[PDB]
Amino acid sequence: AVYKTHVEKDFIAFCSSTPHNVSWRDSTMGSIFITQLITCFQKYSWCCHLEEVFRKVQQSFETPRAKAQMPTIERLSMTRYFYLFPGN
Amino acid sequence: AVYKTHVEKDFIAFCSSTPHNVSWRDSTMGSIFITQLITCFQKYSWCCHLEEVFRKVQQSFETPRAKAQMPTIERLSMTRYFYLFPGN
Amino acid sequence: VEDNCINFVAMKFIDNTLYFIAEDDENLESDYFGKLESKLSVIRNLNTIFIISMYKDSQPRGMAVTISVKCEKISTLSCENKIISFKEMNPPDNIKDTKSDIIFFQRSVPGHDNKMQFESSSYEGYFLACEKERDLFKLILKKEDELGDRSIMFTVQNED
Amino acid sequence: VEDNCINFVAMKFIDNTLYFIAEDDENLESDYFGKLESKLSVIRNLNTIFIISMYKDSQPRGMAVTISVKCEKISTLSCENKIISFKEMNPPDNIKDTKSDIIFFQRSVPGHDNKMQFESSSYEGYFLACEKERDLFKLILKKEDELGDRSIMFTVQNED
Amino acid sequence: ALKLCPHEEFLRLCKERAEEIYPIKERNNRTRLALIICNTEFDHLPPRNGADFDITGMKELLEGLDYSVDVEENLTARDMESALRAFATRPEHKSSDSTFLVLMSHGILEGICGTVHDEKKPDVLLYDTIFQIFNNRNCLSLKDKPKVIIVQAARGANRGELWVRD
Amino acid sequence: ALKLCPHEEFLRLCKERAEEIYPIKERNNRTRLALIICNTEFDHLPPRNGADFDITGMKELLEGLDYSVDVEENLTARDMESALRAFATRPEHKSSDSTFLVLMSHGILEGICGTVHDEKKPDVLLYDTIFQIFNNRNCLSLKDKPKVIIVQAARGANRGELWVRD
């Protein structure tokens, strides 16, 4: 059986910063982006999907503390909602 | 009086198709993408935010009816949820 | 550029002639700078049967392939006497004479190295093609070396 | 490239010398190939006063600008006798003699055409700068025509 | 038609999700602005027949969403950027609280083509340009509120489909 | 720690949102695969001090999410694509239902760079390369399942900050 499908679909890229910007890394506790990403995954994934978690990550970067940066979600081809469901 | 802020923030682009793809349009009824966008806005705006409306538009393009097409969301720098709230 | 054009879905035989319809392009137009010209047409097998079988030859010069369709009596494509015709009945199992209209030679395509056309075995120089005639598509034998009309080739997608 | 460098936020005067601190870079590093060198420093007015006043001259050769800081008694920047000093004397309203340490000439910058440096009016050739000394920052007069240390220029952001 | 949001949800949402949603100002004082740009007649490209229906539908929907829609058509890239900048500096944006950028033309991956585009004479408004015009640096009046961009154009020559096996 | 979703809520969600959410396969027979890359030692760029601290945290989080994480480091761009393609064609992907592509390195707007980047000798893996390697054409085994890509790099050497009054 042969049937149609899209070449590109079900994709999502969480860039560290906006285009024409710079990402910051702390040489003691790691990069701030991943440090916040792990916290949001560990606290919100139980009740929020991947898109919700990424939105929470972005919201946590709204007011600039020390250096200023903002992650973006580029090339989002996702058609459904992605729930990680940790351990369940 | 002065304070820090990001150069780029609160942006969202809803491209007609995925990168390296072709947009299609009905000559006697308008573009399929826009038409779907308008009906989704007219049906779902009252109970969903803008990104949820875009997700509904994308899901409506999941299984390709006749010819194939899939819009994508690019450079999503939004930090909060954007409810249109038609008619106050 | 991965050029793809003309995906036929399914269509039967009418009046001892093979017709093939394509998808519904109800005036749909692209947003690219025109082009959209058609070169090949390969896509079928959307679940009206289009018999294709393989044959081994004692004089190896390419894979021998036979073309047939199902009717009340199964019909077989022929190029006898340098003309196009559908001959009914079935091939006498494994053919013996090499010069037979039933078998055809499949050649690879420069496009994606996944499709293949057919070459007549009863004559040297002929080729199989499907040109744009009226509303539907006509499977008519044409000479590949000569650019006639749009010169659309009848290729087929191989099994994975 | 819209190059930007160290900013400073706020700091006071200690021992009749002006200090200025920057933001907290607790070992934060960029993900771009080095560079990150400092050329200009402009940002202040985040909500210890750094009084700035404008003066009109009967001999127009640029905008006359004075710098003063707030203390128990207000101090004024000076370049008298080709040396740096803070004089705790308030300006005598509109100055009369053109050759006065209080007033300074402001010149626009090549960067974004929004910032301006300060130029001494009591002497010709001097320039105002802020260099990296120890932990905090030193406002020390340096000659702009000579490349000394990193040659950090002290600009100030104009009102919108 | 367009389903109207009942007044219940308006009061029910902002109080409970003030820090997670954008703010909405009063109906009377708010002057929202949107820009609808389409290209129909070209000089080297086939016309986008049916775009006239699309413009009417989008304008009706946006007006239903209370946007003072400005409609432009057949503008070159220079005119593209000029119109975008003029829309960005409109004084009504200070009283505004959102914006909509609806674009529809021929285009490539880099951006959206104008009206005199050619293979030998490139003419296209890049996504970088439109995103840079409306950022917090060039448009100070659009800070901290969404800038929704709607694009109806092509990005590649390759058709977006494939035939696979289940 | 990491919060665990209760089982009955798990069973409740899929039934009520079957066509809104992606499918989840059985726990025991499921080989999810994720890829984590963090090159810290370079040849012309300052080392990414503290990246090793991020590697452990990312690996622990993904393992908590039941991903057979493969960790790589100090890969050239040619090796970048070779490792990505090898991860794409792993036979365990057929039994998988998702994937994660965690990348951390220096980079520019075009993409993430490897370990031999030079201004005279550019070396950088594009995002288009990742999305082309993992699309439905090159990697048929990843059909109809999400492909989450998480990256860290620079884009334009411009500080993403602005000092604006009011």
Swiss-Prot record, chains C, D:
Q: Which InterPro entries match?
A: IL-18, IL-1_fam, IL1/FGF
A Pfam family hit: IL1
Provide the record's note on post-translational modification. Answer: The pro-IL-18 precursor is processed by CASP1, CASP4 or CASP5 to yield its mature, active form. The pro-IL-18 precursor features autoinhibitory interactions between the propeptide and the post-cleavage-site region, preventing recognition by the IL18R1 receptor. Processing by CASP1, CASP4 or CASP5 induces conformational changes to generate critical receptor-binding sites. The mature form is then secreted and released in the extracellular milieu by passing through the gasdermin-D (GSDMD) pore. In contrast, cleavage by CASP3 inactivates IL18.
Q: Where in the cell is it found?
A: Cytoplasm, Cytosol; Secreted
Which key words tag this protein in UniProt?
Answer: Cytokine, Cytoplasm, Inflammatory response, Secreted
Q: Does the keyword Membrane apply?
A: no
Q: What is its main location?
A: cytoplasm
Q: What induces it?
A: In macrophages, release is increased by endocannabinoid anandamide/AEA.
Organism domain of life: Eukaryota
Specify the effect of residue 153 to A.
Reduces binding of the preformed binary complex of IL18 and IL18R1 to IL18RAP
* A GO MF term: cytokine activity
**In UniProt terms, what is the effect of altering residue 61 to A?**
Impairs binding to IL18R1 and the ability to induce IFNG production
Q: What is the effect of changing residue 87 to A?
A: Reduces binding of the preformed binary complex of IL18 and IL18R1 to IL18RAP resulting in impaired IFNG production
Q: Name one GO cellular component term.
A: cytosol
Q: Which GO terms describe its biological process?
A: angiogenesis; cell population proliferation; cell-cell signaling; cellular response to lipopolysaccharide; cholesterol homeostasis; cytokine-mediated signaling pathway; defense response to Gram-positive bacterium; establishment of skin barrier
Site note Cleavage, residues: 31-32
Positions annotated as pro-peptide in this chain are 1-31
Q: What does this protein do?
A: Pro-inflammatory cytokine primarily involved in epithelial barrier repair, polarized T-helper 1 (Th1) cell and natural killer (NK) cell immune responses. Upon binding to IL18R1 and IL18RAP, forms a signaling ternary complex which activates NF-kappa-B, triggering synthesis of inflammatory mediators. Synergizes with IL12/interleukin-12 to induce IFNG synthesis from T-helper 1 (Th1) cells and natural killer (NK) cells.
Family the UniProt entry places it in? Belongs to the IL-1 family.
- Name this polypeptide is given: Interleukin-18
Gene name tied to this protein: IL18
From Swiss-Prot, chains E, F:
Span-the-membrane segments of this chain are none
Result of altering residue 166 to A: Abolished autoprocessing and ability to form a heterotetramer composed of Caspase-4 subunit p10 and Caspase-4 subunit p20, preventing ability to cleave GSDMD and induce pyroptosis
| Active site (UniProt) | 106, 154
The signal sequence is none
Disulphide-bonded residues: none
Quaternary structure annotation from Swiss-Prot or TrEMBL: Heterotetramer that consists of two anti-parallel arranged heterodimers, each one formed by a 20 kDa (Caspase-4 subunit p20) and a 10 kDa (Caspase-4 subunit p10) subunit.
Name of the featured protein: Caspase-4 subunit p20
Q: Which residues of the full protein are shown?
A: 105 to 270 of 377
